[PDB]
Symmetry: C3
Subunit: 93 residues, 3 copies
């Protein structure tokens, strides 16, 4: 069964990738969640150290800034999910 | 070799997915690690701003809260690892 | 087309895994980015609570420490990308 092994493997791939995509989304969701807390912490610190110019000036450091890249991961996930659907679609016609 | 291409591709899939699962676990481990530091930071801030009602009241903001979803990622990883084992198991009988 | 299904599935796998690897890298990049902010926050707190021994002593807690594991994820990604290249290479000779 050649045809058969092709369908089989395509569905194995698809079922693994559904779980990977799910995981990627959830890891990104947790970064987004955690970042809101971290930046609320930073704003609180900026107020506490305002007399000294806020957190970075207070320390005598260049500011570290968070670069949120949820857009990239979200895009890659949706592309993976498209590829899953396309493989199934192609087998279906 | 049809049979052969099926075994081959199944093992390629399995070896890629072992590394993906490993990565997902490690990303989750780092979120868990980092979150403990962020929340210790928050508790410290809640004490420093206690006279003002803690961090959120001090800022005049609704609190941001971290939603830990390690359970979801852990579950998806273990499901991926089950699927790896099942494919190998099926080829073995 | 047995040969054909083997090439096809190998390239499907490869194109999904390129996007997974990309995602893993980006999730790690965001952890690295966020961790710099969290630890700058911690250092600021250590100064504010220095009279009390820094953040952990101030709270009466054992310190929580961030364990960065970018090296692990970076390694797994590069291994996945090697496996992609090797599959293509093998089909090419
Ligand atoms: Cl923080």
């Amino acid at each position: 069964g050649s045809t058969q092994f092709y369908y089989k493997l395509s569905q194995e791939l698809n079922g693994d990738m559904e779980r990977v995509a799910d995981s990627l989304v959830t890891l990104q969701d947790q970064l987004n969640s955690l970042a809101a807390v971290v930046l609320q912490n930073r704003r609180a610190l900026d107020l506490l150290t305002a007399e000294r110019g806020g957190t970075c000036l207070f320390l005598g450091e260049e500011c570290s800034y968070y670069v949120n890249q949820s857009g990239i991961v979200t895009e890659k996930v949706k592309e993976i999910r498209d590829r899953i659907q396309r493989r199934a679609e192609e087998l279906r016609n």
